Design a protein that fits this description.
It comes from Bos taurus. This protein has about 80 residues and is an all-alpha fold. The protein is about 60% helix and about 0% strand. The structure holds lanthanum (III) ion.
């Protein structure tokens, strides 16, 4: 539940598919799977999360956008 682990695990998944410098639906999906499968139960579907996370329009859910989830994962 550490922060350093978030980066590590994150990259561990971001490196899974495509460049680890960018997250994806399938990529994040996995994370959201193990990382927080409960967040998947939310009313925010994968696609919803994907589009939700990306509020810039790059397609990459970099850790930056991820920090946005940490908020929901906090509440
Ligand atoms: La982005």
């Amino acid at each position: 539940k550490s922060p350093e682990e978030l980066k590590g695990i994150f990259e561990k998944y971001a490196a899974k598919e495509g460049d680890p410098n960018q997250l994806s639906k399938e990529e994040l999906k996995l994370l959201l799977q193990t990382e927080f499968p409960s967040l998947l139960k939310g009313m925010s579907t994968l696609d919803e999360l994907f589009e939700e996370l990306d509020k810039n329009g790059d397609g990459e859910v970099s850790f930056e956008e991820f920090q946005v989830l940490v908020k929901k994962i906090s509440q």
